Short mmCIF file of C-alpha atoms and ligand atoms in Angstrom, two decimals:
data_model
loop_
_atom_site.label_atom_id
_atom_site.label_comp_id
_atom_site.label_asym_id
_atom_site.label_seq_id
_atom_site.Cartn_x
_atom_site.Cartn_y
_atom_site.Cartn_z
CA UNK A 168 27.28 123.36 -133.98
CA UNK A 169 24.65 124.48 -131.84
CA UNK A 170 22.96 127.68 -130.66
CA UNK A 171 22.79 129.38 -127.23
CA UNK A 172 18.83 131.75 -126.83
CA UNK A 173 17.22 133.64 -124.40
CA UNK A 174 14.12 133.59 -126.30
CA UNK A 175 11.65 133.96 -123.03
CA UNK A 176 8.86 131.34 -124.40
CA UNK A 177 12.73 129.32 -124.18
CA UNK A 178 14.01 130.13 -121.34
CA UNK A 179 9.99 130.33 -119.19
CA UNK A 180 10.27 126.45 -120.26
CA UNK A 181 13.55 125.27 -119.02
CA UNK A 182 12.35 127.21 -115.75
CA UNK A 183 9.56 125.03 -115.16
CA UNK A 184 8.78 121.29 -114.94
CA UNK A 185 5.38 119.31 -114.67
CA UNK A 186 6.11 119.66 -110.86
CA UNK A 187 4.72 123.39 -111.17
CA UNK A 188 6.45 124.30 -107.74
CA UNK A 189 10.10 124.32 -108.41
CA UNK A 190 11.10 127.70 -111.28
CA UNK A 191 14.70 128.08 -111.04
CA UNK A 192 15.88 130.18 -114.43
CA UNK A 193 18.87 129.63 -116.77
CA UNK A 194 20.80 132.59 -118.41
CA UNK A 195 20.68 131.42 -121.29
CA UNK A 196 19.05 127.43 -123.60
CA UNK A 197 22.14 125.39 -125.35
CA UNK A 198 20.17 124.04 -128.31
CA UNK A 199 22.41 120.89 -129.72
CA UNK A 200 22.78 119.44 -133.27
CA UNK A 201 24.90 117.07 -132.16
CA UNK A 202 26.89 115.22 -128.74
CA UNK A 203 30.96 117.80 -129.97
CA UNK A 204 28.51 120.43 -129.06
CA UNK A 205 26.99 119.09 -125.68
CA UNK A 206 30.60 118.85 -124.81
CA UNK A 207 31.95 121.81 -125.80
CA UNK A 208 29.18 124.19 -123.86
CA UNK A 209 30.16 121.41 -120.92
CA UNK A 210 33.30 121.52 -121.98
CA UNK A 211 33.22 125.45 -121.27
CA UNK A 212 31.72 125.61 -117.64
CA UNK A 213 34.82 122.95 -116.64
CA UNK A 214 36.67 125.25 -117.34
CA UNK A 215 34.58 129.14 -116.83
CA UNK A 216 35.49 130.75 -113.85
CA UNK A 217 32.44 130.69 -112.03
CA UNK A 218 32.08 126.79 -112.81
CA UNK A 219 28.56 128.01 -115.03
CA UNK A 220 26.03 125.23 -113.92
CA UNK A 221 24.32 122.57 -116.73
CA UNK A 222 21.48 120.61 -116.81
CA UNK A 223 19.83 118.08 -120.25
CA UNK A 224 16.25 118.81 -120.07
CA UNK A 225 14.63 115.45 -121.29
CA UNK A 226 10.71 116.66 -121.57
CA UNK A 227 10.62 118.23 -118.48
CA UNK A 228 8.71 115.71 -116.50
CA UNK A 229 10.63 116.52 -112.71
CA UNK A 230 8.58 117.13 -110.79
CA UNK A 231 10.75 119.04 -107.96
CA UNK A 232 13.46 121.00 -110.92
CA UNK A 233 15.21 118.40 -110.96
CA UNK A 234 16.64 119.61 -115.02
CA UNK A 235 16.73 122.70 -113.52
CA UNK A 236 20.07 124.73 -113.61
CA UNK A 237 19.85 128.37 -111.73
CA UNK A 238 21.60 130.45 -113.55
CA UNK A 239 23.58 128.50 -116.12
CA UNK A 240 23.05 127.16 -119.67
CA UNK A 241 19.35 124.26 -119.79
CA UNK A 242 20.67 122.09 -122.71
CA UNK A 243 17.29 121.34 -124.81
CA UNK A 244 17.79 117.61 -125.88
CA UNK A 245 14.67 117.19 -126.93
CA UNK A 246 15.67 117.45 -131.61
CA UNK A 247 11.87 116.07 -132.88
CA UNK A 248 18.77 114.93 -138.00
CA UNK A 249 19.67 111.27 -139.53
CA UNK A 250 18.28 107.88 -137.30
CA UNK A 251 20.30 105.27 -136.94
CA UNK A 252 18.41 101.82 -137.31
CA UNK A 253 17.92 99.18 -136.00
CA UNK A 254 20.33 96.19 -135.81
CA UNK A 255 21.03 92.29 -135.11
CA UNK A 256 24.12 91.28 -133.52
CA UNK A 257 24.71 86.95 -133.17
CA UNK A 258 27.16 87.70 -130.15
CA UNK A 259 24.72 89.18 -127.69
CA UNK A 260 21.63 86.79 -129.19
CA UNK A 261 18.70 89.58 -130.32
CA UNK A 262 18.36 93.45 -131.82
CA UNK A 263 19.75 96.58 -130.34
CA UNK A 264 18.99 100.68 -131.52
CA UNK A 265 21.48 103.94 -131.24
CA UNK A 266 19.41 106.57 -130.25
CA UNK A 267 20.20 110.04 -129.59
CA UNK A 268 19.60 110.48 -125.38
CA UNK A 269 16.79 113.30 -126.33
CA UNK A 270 14.58 111.64 -127.61
CA UNK A 271 11.31 110.35 -126.81
CA UNK A 272 9.69 106.59 -126.01
CA UNK A 273 7.49 107.56 -128.12
CA UNK A 274 9.21 108.44 -130.98
CA UNK A 275 11.91 105.37 -130.51
CA UNK A 276 8.97 102.80 -130.76
CA UNK A 277 7.27 104.00 -133.76
CA UNK A 278 11.04 103.79 -135.74
CA UNK A 279 11.76 100.84 -134.35
CA UNK A 280 7.62 99.37 -135.48
CA UNK A 281 8.31 100.65 -138.68
CA UNK A 282 12.57 99.27 -138.50
CA UNK A 283 11.68 95.15 -138.42
CA UNK A 284 8.23 95.87 -135.87
CA UNK A 285 10.13 95.42 -133.62
CA UNK A 286 10.21 98.09 -130.05
CA UNK A 287 12.41 97.94 -126.26
CA UNK A 288 10.49 95.06 -123.85
CA UNK A 289 10.84 96.96 -120.53
CA UNK A 290 8.69 100.58 -120.69
CA UNK A 291 7.20 103.43 -118.78
CA UNK A 292 3.02 103.97 -117.81
CA UNK A 293 3.89 106.81 -119.70
CA UNK A 294 6.21 108.10 -123.39
CA UNK A 295 6.27 111.43 -123.39
CA UNK A 296 9.50 111.14 -121.23
CA UNK A 297 13.45 111.24 -122.78
CA UNK A 298 15.77 107.92 -123.28
CA UNK A 299 18.06 109.68 -121.49
CA UNK A 300 15.61 111.84 -118.59
CA UNK A 301 14.07 107.83 -117.83
CA UNK A 302 17.85 105.83 -117.86
CA UNK A 303 19.42 108.63 -115.44
CA UNK A 304 16.54 106.66 -112.85
CA UNK A 305 14.86 103.74 -113.87
CA UNK A 306 12.35 103.50 -116.38
CA UNK A 307 9.80 101.92 -114.85
CA UNK A 308 6.31 100.34 -115.78
CA UNK A 309 4.60 96.71 -115.57
CA UNK A 310 6.77 94.92 -117.37
CA UNK A 311 10.21 95.00 -115.10
CA UNK A 312 8.81 92.19 -112.85
CA UNK A 313 9.72 90.24 -115.90
CA UNK A 314 12.43 92.44 -117.91
CA UNK A 315 13.74 94.63 -114.94
CA UNK A 316 13.60 98.44 -115.54
CA UNK A 317 14.34 100.35 -118.87
CA UNK A 318 17.84 100.95 -116.66
CA UNK A 319 18.34 97.09 -117.01
CA UNK A 320 17.74 96.57 -121.08
CA UNK A 321 20.45 99.19 -122.47
CA UNK A 322 23.70 97.58 -123.12
CA UNK A 323 25.98 100.80 -123.70
CA UNK A 324 25.94 104.88 -123.39
CA UNK A 325 27.62 107.92 -125.04
CA UNK A 326 28.40 110.23 -121.62
CA UNK A 327 29.70 113.58 -121.56
CA UNK A 328 31.16 113.92 -118.26
CA UNK A 329 31.47 117.24 -116.37
CA UNK A 330 34.82 117.35 -117.89
CA UNK A 331 33.23 117.67 -120.98
CA UNK A 332 34.19 114.56 -122.96
CA UNK A 333 32.95 112.28 -124.79
CA UNK A 334 33.26 108.72 -123.40
CA UNK A 335 32.14 105.32 -124.71
CA UNK A 336 31.18 103.02 -122.00
CA UNK A 337 29.59 99.18 -120.96
CA UNK A 338 29.72 96.61 -118.76
CA UNK A 339 32.66 95.92 -120.62
CA UNK A 340 33.85 99.08 -120.89
CA UNK A 341 34.33 102.10 -119.16
CA UNK A 342 31.58 100.03 -116.40
CA UNK A 343 31.71 102.35 -113.50
CA UNK A 344 31.04 105.53 -115.23
CA UNK A 345 28.16 103.10 -117.21
CA UNK A 346 26.58 101.56 -113.94
CA UNK A 347 27.07 105.20 -112.25
CA UNK A 348 25.14 106.90 -115.33
CA UNK A 349 22.40 104.76 -114.87
CA UNK A 350 19.91 106.35 -112.96
CA UNK A 351 22.85 108.13 -111.40
CA UNK A 352 20.12 110.82 -111.40
CA UNK A 353 22.15 113.01 -114.39
CA UNK A 354 24.99 113.26 -111.67
CA UNK A 355 28.44 111.91 -113.39
CA UNK A 356 27.23 112.96 -117.45
CA UNK A 357 24.91 114.03 -120.14
CA UNK A 358 24.05 110.89 -121.88
CA UNK A 359 23.92 111.22 -125.91
CA UNK A 360 23.15 107.98 -127.65
CA UNK A 361 21.76 105.00 -125.71
CA UNK A 362 21.75 101.32 -127.14
CA UNK A 363 18.35 100.04 -126.52
CA UNK A 364 17.91 96.33 -126.60
CA UNK A 365 14.90 95.60 -128.80
CA UNK A 366 12.62 91.66 -129.79
CA UNK A 367 10.05 91.07 -131.93
CA UNK A 368 7.08 93.88 -130.80
CA UNK A 369 3.59 91.64 -130.39
CA UNK A 370 1.06 93.23 -132.24
CA UNK A 371 -2.13 93.29 -129.99
CA UNK A 372 -3.02 93.53 -126.18
CA UNK A 373 -4.90 92.00 -123.87
CA UNK A 374 -5.61 94.06 -121.54
CA UNK A 375 -7.37 92.90 -118.08
CA UNK A 376 -8.78 94.40 -115.19
CA UNK A 377 -10.13 93.13 -111.94
CA UNK A 378 -11.38 93.51 -108.88
CA UNK A 379 -10.68 92.89 -105.30
CA UNK A 380 -11.71 94.34 -102.05
CA UNK A 381 -9.00 92.55 -99.60
CA UNK A 382 -5.99 93.74 -99.67
CA UNK A 383 -4.05 90.31 -98.29
CA UNK A 384 -5.44 88.52 -100.68
CA UNK A 385 -4.61 91.39 -104.10
CA UNK A 386 -0.97 92.03 -103.47
CA UNK A 387 -1.02 87.31 -102.91
CA UNK A 388 -2.04 87.60 -106.05
CA UNK A 389 0.11 90.40 -107.67
CA UNK A 390 3.37 88.47 -105.67
CA UNK A 391 2.16 85.11 -107.49
CA UNK A 392 1.75 86.91 -110.85
CA UNK A 393 5.29 88.30 -110.35
CA UNK A 394 6.95 84.41 -110.12
CA UNK A 395 5.85 82.98 -112.97
CA UNK A 396 7.33 82.28 -116.09
CA UNK A 397 10.05 79.38 -114.72
CA UNK A 398 11.28 77.05 -117.31
CA UNK A 399 9.21 79.75 -119.97
CA UNK A 400 5.56 79.47 -118.17
CA UNK A 401 2.29 80.81 -119.21
CA UNK A 402 2.60 84.40 -117.62
CA UNK A 403 1.37 87.68 -118.27
CA UNK A 404 3.48 90.41 -119.88
CA UNK A 405 2.49 93.28 -117.75
CA UNK A 406 0.81 93.97 -114.15
CA UNK A 407 -0.17 97.18 -112.47
CA UNK A 408 -2.52 97.36 -110.23
CA UNK A 409 -4.25 100.28 -108.46
CA UNK A 410 -6.75 101.55 -104.94
CA UNK A 411 -9.67 102.63 -105.81
CA UNK A 412 -12.63 104.67 -103.83
CA UNK A 413 -15.21 102.56 -102.91
CA UNK A 414 -18.59 104.55 -105.32
CA UNK A 415 -16.20 93.93 -97.50
CA UNK A 416 -14.72 96.46 -97.75
CA UNK A 417 -14.74 101.32 -98.32
CA UNK A 418 -11.39 100.50 -100.57
CA UNK A 419 -11.58 98.30 -104.11
CA UNK A 420 -8.03 97.16 -105.40
CA UNK A 421 -7.90 97.16 -109.17
CA UNK A 422 -5.67 93.76 -110.46
CA UNK A 423 -4.03 95.11 -114.24
CA UNK A 424 -2.94 92.64 -116.08
CA UNK A 425 -1.91 92.31 -120.32
CA UNK A 426 -1.48 88.95 -122.64
CA UNK A 427 0.65 90.14 -125.32
CA UNK A 428 -0.06 88.35 -128.52
CA UNK A 429 1.23 88.44 -132.86
CA UNK A 430 -0.83 86.51 -135.84
CA UNK A 431 1.49 83.06 -134.22
CA UNK A 432 -0.21 82.89 -130.84
CA UNK A 433 -3.12 84.60 -131.94
CA UNK A 434 -5.48 81.44 -131.34
CA UNK A 435 -3.74 80.24 -127.59
CA UNK A 436 -4.31 84.23 -126.40
CA UNK A 437 -8.63 83.18 -125.17
CA UNK A 438 -7.05 79.46 -122.88
CA UNK A 439 -4.04 81.35 -121.92
CA UNK A 440 -5.98 84.10 -120.61
CA UNK A 441 -8.60 81.78 -119.01
CA UNK A 442 -5.82 80.08 -117.33
CA UNK A 443 -3.74 82.71 -115.11
CA UNK A 444 -7.28 84.25 -114.42
CA UNK A 445 -8.86 80.83 -113.07
CA UNK A 446 -5.66 80.74 -110.42
CA UNK A 447 -6.76 83.99 -109.63
CA UNK A 448 -8.74 85.31 -106.42
CA UNK A 449 -10.62 88.88 -108.19
CA UNK A 450 -13.79 88.96 -106.95
CA UNK A 451 -16.20 87.27 -109.11
CA UNK A 452 -17.89 88.34 -112.45
CA UNK A 453 -15.89 91.73 -112.36
CA UNK A 454 -13.46 91.09 -115.08
CA UNK A 455 -13.15 94.15 -117.44
CA UNK A 456 -11.39 93.19 -121.13
CA UNK A 457 -10.08 95.57 -123.72
CA UNK A 458 -8.49 93.64 -127.25
CA UNK A 459 -6.81 96.54 -129.27
CA UNK A 460 -3.14 97.14 -130.64
CA UNK A 461 0.52 97.36 -129.26
CA UNK A 462 1.10 100.69 -130.13
CA UNK A 463 -2.64 102.21 -128.94
CA UNK A 464 -2.27 100.11 -125.24
CA UNK A 465 1.54 101.78 -124.55
CA UNK A 466 -0.17 104.84 -126.01
CA UNK A 467 -2.52 104.73 -123.08
CA UNK A 468 -1.85 107.96 -120.65
CA UNK A 469 -0.63 110.51 -123.50
CA UNK A 470 -5.20 109.49 -124.44
CA UNK A 471 -5.49 110.13 -120.56
CA UNK A 472 -3.51 113.41 -121.31
CA UNK A 473 -5.83 115.21 -123.55
CA UNK A 474 -8.46 114.86 -122.28
CA UNK A 475 -6.75 116.51 -119.45
CA UNK A 476 -5.51 119.40 -122.17
CA UNK A 477 -9.33 119.31 -122.97
CA UNK A 478 -10.72 120.48 -119.44
CA UNK A 479 -7.66 122.85 -118.36
CA UNK A 480 -6.70 120.17 -116.12
CA UNK A 481 -3.38 119.32 -117.76
CA UNK A 482 -1.20 122.98 -116.95
CA UNK A 483 -1.65 122.00 -112.12
CA UNK A 484 0.79 121.66 -110.16
CA UNK A 485 1.53 117.98 -109.63
CA UNK A 486 2.50 117.26 -106.34
CA UNK A 487 3.10 113.06 -107.52
CA UNK A 488 5.42 111.25 -104.52
CA UNK A 489 6.89 107.44 -105.45
CA UNK A 490 8.07 104.84 -103.01
CA UNK A 491 9.25 102.06 -103.27
CA UNK A 492 7.88 100.23 -100.14
CA UNK A 493 9.68 96.86 -99.33
CA UNK A 494 6.66 93.84 -100.12
CA UNK A 495 7.21 92.46 -95.92
CA UNK A 496 6.58 96.52 -95.41
CA UNK A 497 3.03 96.44 -97.87
CA UNK A 498 -0.06 95.33 -95.06
CA UNK A 499 0.10 98.05 -92.91
CA UNK A 500 0.48 100.93 -95.91
CA UNK A 501 -2.61 99.47 -96.37
CA UNK A 502 -4.23 100.15 -92.92
CA UNK A 503 -1.89 103.14 -92.15
CA UNK A 504 -1.92 105.53 -95.74
CA UNK A 505 -5.04 104.40 -98.20
CA UNK A 506 -7.22 103.73 -95.43
CA UNK A 507 -5.73 105.76 -93.14
CA UNK A 508 -3.80 109.01 -94.78
CA UNK A 509 -5.77 109.11 -97.64
CA UNK A 510 -9.19 107.98 -95.77
CA UNK A 511 -12.61 109.76 -96.25
CA UNK A 512 -13.32 112.28 -98.18
CA UNK A 513 -9.28 113.78 -99.53
CA UNK A 514 -9.27 116.65 -102.21
CA UNK A 515 -7.38 113.66 -107.36
CA UNK A 516 -5.87 111.58 -109.60
CA UNK A 517 -4.31 107.02 -109.34
CA UNK A 518 -2.67 106.14 -107.04
CA UNK A 519 -1.11 102.41 -107.94
CA UNK A 520 0.62 99.79 -106.45
CA UNK A 521 1.89 96.86 -107.90
CA UNK A 522 5.55 94.65 -106.87
CA UNK A 523 8.29 94.25 -108.87
CA UNK A 524 11.92 91.12 -108.41
CA UNK A 525 14.85 93.38 -106.63
CA UNK A 526 17.34 90.67 -108.77
CA UNK A 527 16.03 92.00 -112.69
CA UNK A 528 18.53 95.23 -111.29
CA UNK A 529 21.79 95.09 -111.50
CA UNK A 530 23.22 95.89 -108.46
CA UNK A 531 26.06 98.16 -110.10
CA UNK A 532 23.61 100.82 -110.56
CA UNK A 533 23.41 104.34 -109.51
CA UNK A 534 19.57 102.53 -108.51
CA UNK A 535 18.13 102.54 -104.63
CA UNK A 536 15.66 100.09 -104.01
CA UNK A 537 14.71 98.53 -100.52
CA UNK A 538 16.74 95.77 -99.14
CA UNK A 539 13.99 92.82 -99.93
CA UNK A 540 13.75 90.40 -103.71
CA UNK A 541 10.59 91.72 -103.45
CA UNK A 542 8.60 95.11 -103.22
CA UNK A 543 6.21 97.20 -104.45
CA UNK A 544 6.30 100.60 -105.48
CA UNK A 545 3.44 102.82 -104.43
CA UNK A 546 2.47 105.06 -106.68
CA UNK A 547 0.72 108.44 -105.81
CA UNK A 548 -0.02 110.20 -109.01
CA UNK A 549 -2.33 113.76 -107.18
CA UNK A 550 -2.38 116.77 -109.25
CA UNK A 551 -4.05 120.76 -107.66
CA UNK A 552 -6.73 122.01 -108.80
CA UNK A 553 -6.67 124.28 -111.12
CA UNK A 554 -5.42 128.04 -110.08
CA UNK A 555 -6.03 127.43 -106.33
CA UNK A 556 -2.30 126.87 -104.62
CA UNK A 557 -3.86 125.86 -101.12
CA UNK A 558 -4.76 123.08 -103.10
CA UNK A 559 -0.90 121.84 -103.63
CA UNK A 560 -1.15 122.44 -100.37
CA UNK A 561 -2.93 120.10 -98.94
CA UNK A 562 -1.49 117.57 -101.49
CA UNK A 563 1.81 118.48 -99.88
CA UNK A 564 1.14 117.85 -96.45
CA UNK A 565 -0.51 114.16 -97.72
CA UNK A 566 2.66 113.13 -98.58
CA UNK A 567 5.10 114.58 -95.86
CA UNK A 568 2.18 112.15 -93.94
CA UNK A 569 3.18 109.41 -95.58
CA UNK A 570 6.64 110.47 -95.66
CA UNK A 571 6.14 110.65 -91.33
CA UNK A 572 4.38 106.94 -90.75
CA UNK A 573 7.32 105.11 -92.88
CA UNK A 574 9.68 106.80 -90.95
CA UNK A 575 7.45 106.61 -87.33
CA UNK A 576 6.79 102.71 -88.69
CA UNK A 577 10.74 102.27 -89.32
CA UNK A 578 8.77 100.94 -93.47
CA UNK A 579 12.71 100.91 -94.91
CA UNK A 580 10.46 103.11 -97.99
CA UNK A 581 12.56 104.27 -100.65
CA UNK A 582 11.45 107.10 -102.79
CA UNK A 583 11.47 107.09 -106.61
CA UNK A 584 12.90 110.13 -108.48
CA UNK A 585 14.09 111.28 -105.17
CA UNK A 586 13.02 114.75 -104.10
CA UNK A 587 15.74 115.26 -100.80
CA UNK A 588 17.64 118.06 -100.90
CA UNK A 589 19.23 117.63 -96.75
CA UNK A 590 22.82 116.40 -97.25
CA UNK A 591 22.30 113.85 -94.05
CA UNK A 592 18.26 112.69 -96.21
CA UNK A 593 20.79 112.17 -98.87
CA UNK A 594 23.58 109.69 -97.16
CA UNK A 595 20.24 107.96 -95.45
CA UNK A 596 18.45 107.73 -99.39
CA UNK A 597 21.52 105.42 -99.81
CA UNK A 598 22.87 104.03 -97.24
CA UNK A 599 27.13 104.16 -96.19
CA UNK A 600 28.39 101.75 -99.41
CA UNK A 601 26.24 103.04 -101.55
CA UNK A 602 27.09 106.68 -100.58
CA UNK A 603 31.17 106.37 -100.91
CA UNK A 604 30.70 104.46 -104.66
CA UNK A 605 28.48 107.62 -105.65
CA UNK A 606 30.30 110.95 -103.31
CA UNK A 607 33.58 109.18 -105.39
CA UNK A 608 31.85 108.89 -108.76
CA UNK A 609 30.73 112.80 -108.54
CA UNK A 610 34.49 113.50 -107.64
CA UNK A 611 35.77 111.32 -110.67
CA UNK A 612 33.71 112.76 -113.36
CA UNK A 613 32.08 115.57 -112.35
CA UNK A 614 34.14 117.67 -110.02
CA UNK A 615 33.02 121.20 -110.13
CA UNK A 616 29.19 119.61 -109.34
CA UNK A 617 27.82 121.15 -112.44
CA UNK A 618 25.71 118.92 -113.52
CA UNK A 619 21.60 118.33 -112.61
CA UNK A 620 22.84 120.56 -109.18
CA UNK A 621 18.19 121.06 -109.41
CA UNK A 622 18.72 117.09 -108.12
CA UNK A 623 20.09 119.30 -104.90
CA UNK A 624 22.97 116.49 -103.72
CA UNK A 625 26.28 118.04 -104.45
CA UNK A 626 27.70 121.81 -104.27
CA UNK A 627 30.42 123.55 -106.04
C1 FAD B 245 5.60 114.17 -115.89
C2 FAD B 245 5.69 112.26 -116.27
C3 FAD B 245 6.46 112.31 -115.30
C4 FAD B 245 6.88 110.18 -116.18
C5 FAD B 245 5.21 109.17 -115.85
C6 FAD B 245 4.75 110.12 -116.19
C7 FAD B 245 4.12 111.36 -116.87
C8 FAD B 245 3.10 112.26 -117.42
N1 FAD B 245 5.12 108.25 -116.55
C9 FAD B 245 5.98 107.50 -115.82
C10 FAD B 245 7.03 106.05 -115.66
O1 FAD B 245 5.43 105.90 -116.55
N2 FAD B 245 7.41 105.53 -115.22
C11 FAD B 245 8.41 106.26 -114.76
O2 FAD B 245 9.27 105.89 -114.66
N3 FAD B 245 8.55 107.68 -114.90
C12 FAD B 245 7.66 108.05 -115.18
N4 FAD B 245 7.79 109.35 -115.32
C13 FAD B 245 9.13 110.21 -114.60
C14 FAD B 245 9.98 110.88 -115.64
O3 FAD B 245 10.96 109.19 -115.76
C15 FAD B 245 10.71 110.93 -114.67
O4 FAD B 245 10.71 112.31 -114.99
C16 FAD B 245 12.24 111.67 -115.87
O5 FAD B 245 13.39 112.51 -115.31
C17 FAD B 245 12.89 111.13 -117.31
O6 FAD B 245 11.52 112.72 -117.91
P1 FAD B 245 11.86 113.64 -118.35
O7 FAD B 245 12.79 112.83 -119.69
O8 FAD B 245 11.81 114.75 -119.44
O9 FAD B 245 13.87 114.46 -118.36
P2 FAD B 245 14.35 115.28 -116.95
O10 FAD B 245 12.78 115.43 -116.44
O11 FAD B 245 14.25 116.75 -118.03
O12 FAD B 245 15.24 114.93 -116.60
C18 FAD B 245 15.04 114.78 -115.46
C19 FAD B 245 16.48 114.42 -114.77
O13 FAD B 245 17.58 113.66 -115.37
C20 FAD B 245 18.53 115.01 -116.28
N5 FAD B 245 18.05 114.91 -117.58
C21 FAD B 245 17.91 114.37 -118.57
N6 FAD B 245 17.75 114.12 -119.74
C22 FAD B 245 19.41 113.72 -119.61
C23 FAD B 245 20.09 113.33 -120.46
N7 FAD B 245 20.41 111.91 -122.07
N8 FAD B 245 21.46 112.54 -119.97
C24 FAD B 245 21.62 112.36 -118.75
N9 FAD B 245 21.05 113.65 -118.28
C25 FAD B 245 20.00 113.55 -118.22
C26 FAD B 245 17.93 116.98 -115.99
O14 FAD B 245 18.73 117.42 -115.41
C27 FAD B 245 16.99 116.08 -114.26
O15 FAD B 245 17.74 115.53 -113.40
N1 V1X B 246 -2.91 104.68 -114.92
C1 V1X B 246 -1.87 105.64 -114.86
O1 V1X B 246 -0.74 104.42 -115.49
C2 V1X B 246 -1.75 106.47 -115.18
C3 V1X B 246 -2.85 107.22 -115.26
C4 V1X B 246 -2.55 108.99 -115.43
C5 V1X B 246 -2.11 109.80 -115.45
O2 V1X B 246 -1.69 111.18 -114.99
C6 V1X B 246 -1.44 111.83 -116.18
F1 V1X B 246 -1.30 112.75 -115.87
F2 V1X B 246 -0.27 111.87 -117.03
F3 V1X B 246 -2.19 111.87 -116.89
C7 V1X B 246 -0.46 109.32 -115.40
C8 V1X B 246 -0.39 107.40 -115.21
N2 V1X B 246 0.95 107.37 -114.46
C9 V1X B 246 2.13 107.31 -114.61
O3 V1X B 246 2.09 108.92 -114.47
N3 V1X B 246 2.64 106.84 -113.83
C10 V1X B 246 4.08 107.17 -113.14
C11 V1X B 246 4.49 108.42 -113.12
C12 V1X B 246 5.94 108.80 -112.43
CL1 V1X B 246 5.60 110.07 -112.16
C13 V1X B 246 6.73 107.55 -111.88
C14 V1X B 246 5.67 106.03 -112.22
CL2 V1X B 246 7.02 104.61 -111.77
C15 V1X B 246 4.53 105.80 -112.99
C16 V1X B 246 4.73 104.91 -113.10
C17 V1X B 246 3.66 104.08 -112.68
O4 V1X B 246 3.37 102.90 -112.51
#
């Protein structure tokens, strides 16, 4: 059913990622038509004497070669086939939609909106990412504080294991494989189908930004906003934040919130926004508001992408670092990182910061979060200058200084999209109990370590 390709443009693309550093080439790219084709290729690799590497490629958004299969086969999961329609279940209480693992979230959104005006409730900031790719990590944006990450909004999967077997899993059947695959860094199988939870989509968004010069007030407000919702009370539907340079304090903190509304709630949206904002301690006269359709809001980062491609600033190295930081240690992070490591005239990109609630993350999954109820995501999304290798080198040293700071002060930070490569680093990342559950799962579902070897956790 599928097609092996040795096309130079296919090899070149499967040999790079958005990071622009890791460049391990495969022998061929496999283009499947269905799940049985993926099972066939993984089956062949499992049975092969050498046991060649097989890695699924979503949209190639990895930072450090996580989707590369050195001298093996990259499965180009992109499709562009008949799509399953959203379904209502009186047992689950709501809707779901079965999607192909290679499907882009942007295409899922458009499909579910055009079929019942439905949409997933937990997003990523950027929608040109595969479903299987985000579900192998977590899938985070401003909704995770309330709905949990995307791995907390999936009912079932079809997984092609490292033994080339197709398995249907969920909380009730084969749960070990289901929870293992979720946040599992592609280690135990290839997601060929995911059953995404859906809600009735809002039609419009009231998008707000408010400035702060005091980090204690900014963090205190973010932490209060993510605690709202008891008895279905008033709350924002999205809570993010970012660190801004001065051009009271030389560092400004931008709080970013949204209030989702439809035809029925259009009347109460203005009062709801003013009531929630009134309780906050942002700088007076720093409120910036936008009103736009839901799709336009969710697609905001693709618009930033278009501006970058127009300036030759998209195909540049992206040494992006993502950290989860316990809330008990976040104040020290401002002093030491935002003002310290990144202080002064440092040479491009956002630094996002916002808290989340650990209780929205299922502890049975493979995802690694700090051992604290409230933790922040700190996303250093700084890009290197075009055709300037030294720019990448300086950003890499800065990232290592951030990591050294956390280790040196005992901040129990955890890396999201972990870029570790040594066994002792992975053991520390997971901790003893989680490492044991991880390795046991690998022994059962990928004993030959065929899958996602670019993650550099296990070796054949
Ligand atoms: C490039 C980028 C990434 C990004 C983002 C914005 C940009 C410009 N915004 C994000 C956001 O707001 N929130 C978030 O949580 N992540 C965000 N990212 C990162 C993104 O989630 C990751 O890059 C992730 O890997 C998904 O990207 P993609 O779909 O392109 O997947 P990949 O890089 O090729 O693969 C990643 C790993 O998973 C394995 N893999 C891929 N597909 C599958 C399937 N179907 N099943 C199982 N494993 C799979 C790869 O082999 C690799 O190990
Ligand atoms: N403000 C924005 O949201 C954003 C803007 C520009 C952009 O850069 C561009 F090059 F794509 F234009 C990317 C943005 N956001 C983004 O990529 N976020 C992101 C990435 C990873 Cl790798 C990991 C996690 Cl957790 C997150 C989510 C953080 O909230």
